RNA sequence: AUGAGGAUUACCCAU
RNA sequence: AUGAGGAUUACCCAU
RNA sequence: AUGAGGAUUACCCAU
RNA sequence: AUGAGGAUUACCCAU
């Protein structure tokens, strides 16, 4: 066992899938990056700290790039037109059992399931109404 | 007893379970992540330290993704809308024996057991009433 | 009722029990140690005193060795990695009768009884949840 | 009963065993030393105090010497090339029953058992990985 | 998945091989050390970091000891008569793809291959001629 | 007899192999450069010198270019989009015999062997984890 | 009271 | 440039 | 002489 | 510690 393994970030049904792999663990921050130049890579980081005497806090971040080729000084460089950033913070009391935590995971999964309000809004450049 | 191993975080009874596996150990801070992009993964980190002369403190952090209307592998912004954060901090006096600690763990499991108030509130998007 | 005597600290049901026996009485501070080097022994000390005009206070300290991967009689450094420390301080008002005190002892036994939260937490390297 | 008795600190299977014996109890500090010149002896000390109103703290220390013969001013003296020090502090709430304490002892014993992670690392001049 | 593992630093067939094992990863600096006396051990450290806006930089260090015994006052200690210090810094622009990096590694391996100028000059206390 | 000769820096089988050839040896600094445009060439320099009374020190440098064509005003020139810079210093006491040096070289070759931590971390835009 | 602070005449140190 | 000048990280020194 | 200091006409910087 | 605060070298900002 070791949960620090590679995984499929973007699932495009076996073709053009974006898989992310472990790349660094310096300073207690777990990092995963897609197989690209550091300038065009997808990035995922995770860290856990004992925020309070009775809380533990997970800090998760994802970076989705819009890859492009830019000409600088007459030369072509692999670059990122822009990046989308996801920053999530999860605070869990120390009294939460494993089953209480499994509940939290399922909630986050249900939150983003296809067809549900939120992902439907995001995917359509809309708000909730 | 090497305890840094893979384990079931969200138990949906064999089918659709969420397994979290070791992914980083930088700075004695153990990390576990699910097989997802880091922006949509379930993340768990844990570390222990002597907070003061009389106490030891465990800091546990968990991150859970919102799943409803989630687009697997997609770029979902703002991050704060798609993630839940749990920060647990457990303070244990240096006088606590293994038995004392086992009792402390039971208190945590009981706090989160199915049907008890706290988890029933969280799950129903409610408070106490 | 001379109570300074040998007694079973860790009960593993007759076989593999850890007995602790009187080893020092300097300064009215009773001490008990297991039959080990002092760096790997189970140690227990107890003393009572009038903390203030209205209270009496018992100070109980226990030391427990980390046993997993322990080398009997070997030199294990750093000390702080191989030992657990328990500091108990019990304050009892001078008005407490023997009955009141018996009740206080039951509260302590109940707090640590098998299956209750606190010991269940400690034993599972967890907090409350 | 009196737990202040001699015991085998280093077990080398009946031959070359390092047994330690009671040597002092001044100032509430129980001391044991191996049968050597005070300059080359193994030393073990234990003391218990009521650290807080509700905690008891055991302070245990072991000293493992590397014996050598040094020539000073043209004369040979029994000496110690260097010493390894183990300092452990154990804090136990006053609410811990005897069985809760037996749990603590077993934990420390399991922690150092041959073959387990920690003693395996120490014995090999390595870290955990 | 982890690359912070044990590995062979010096390959002498399969007998006399020098192996370094992880020992510590504090402050983003990974450290490996060979077994036995830390005083006579081989050391290797590695760290990575964003030096500037477009460059990541690796700092790798190796220490080769000259194993010897020091005798002073008739007291002998295992020591290193002296040490050889290899210190290298590698800068890589964030535009480097994995292919580009693989090339950079082959350049380093080729630079030190048996028979080539640099490695054979060093192996003979010589310079270029 | 001479070691200031041509050699293979990058080994790609036998086709696409990068070869550097001597170019200049002024001021005790030996320099090798690959053929074609100096602008897109691989560079290697090496020098040795008595740093202190007991230490000799080698300073080796390698430059890996990213071959590209720059177009400005419709005028294209062969250039390097950027360069990777390897800079290493090796210190060796004057007490090192040829055997000691050979060991130091094997340590360097082992440090970069395929499959080992450092070389595989670099080859993947990653760090240690 | 806390330190994955240092040492070794049950001792210094920081907060 | 010279020294039957001195030393030893291809270096000081006198004229 | 040291830097997990920065770069890239064997070069700058801090101590 | 809190922000339906801002960004993107695990970083600034207000309270």
UniProtKB/Swiss-Prot annotation, chains A, B, C, D, E, F:
Outcome of substituting residue 45 to A: Loss of repression of replicase translation. 80% loss of binding to the operator RNA in vivo
TM segment ranges: none
Gene Ontology CC: T=3 icosahedral viral capsid
One annotated GO molecular function: identical protein binding
Region of interest (Viral RNA-binding), ranges: 31-104
Subcellular location(s) per record: Virion
Pfam family of the protein (one): Levi_coat
Keywords noted in UniProt: Capsid protein, RNA-binding, T=3 icosahedral capsid protein, Translation regulation, Virion
Primary subcellular site in the record, as a coarse category: virion
SUPFAM superfamilies named among the record's database cross-references: RNA bacteriophage capsid protein
GO BP annotation list: negative regulation of viral translation; regulation of translation
Family of this protein: Belongs to the Leviviricetes capsid protein family.
Known function: Capsid protein self-assembles to form an icosahedral capsid with a T=3 symmetry, about 26 nm in diameter, and consisting of 89 capsid proteins dimers (178 capsid proteins). Involved in viral genome encapsidation through the interaction between a capsid protein dimer and the multiple packaging signals present in the RNA genome. The capsid also contains 1 copy of the A2 maturation protein. Acts as a translational repressor of viral replicase synthesis late in infection. This latter function is the result of capsid protein interaction with an RNA hairpin which contains the replicase ribosome-binding site.
Oligomeric and partner information: Homodimer. The capsid proteins form dimers that assemble by group of 5. Twelve such pentamers are linked together with free dimers. The homodimers binds to the viral RNA via an operator hairpin, but also to many other RNA sequences in the viral genome; this interaction probably shifts the virus from the replicative to the assembly phase and ensures specific encapsidation of the viral genome.
Name of the protein in question: Capsid protein
């Amino acid at each position: 066992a070791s949960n620090f393994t590679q995984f499929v970030l973007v699932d495009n049904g076996g073709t053009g899938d974006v898989t992310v792999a472990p790349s660094n663990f310096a300073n207690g921050v777990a990092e995963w990056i897609s197989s690209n130049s550091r300038s065009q890579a997808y990035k995922v980081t995770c860290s856990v700290r004992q925020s309070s005497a009775q809380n533990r806090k997970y800090t998760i971040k994802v970076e989705v790039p819009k890859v492009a080729t830019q000409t600088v000084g007459g030369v072509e460089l692999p670059v990122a037109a822009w990046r989308s950033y996801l920053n999530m913070e999860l605070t869990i009391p120390i009294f939460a059992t494993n089953s209480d935590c499994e509940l939290i995971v399922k909630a986050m999964q249900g939150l983003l399931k296809d067809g549900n309000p939120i992902p439907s809004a995001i995917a359509a450049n809309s708000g909730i109404y």
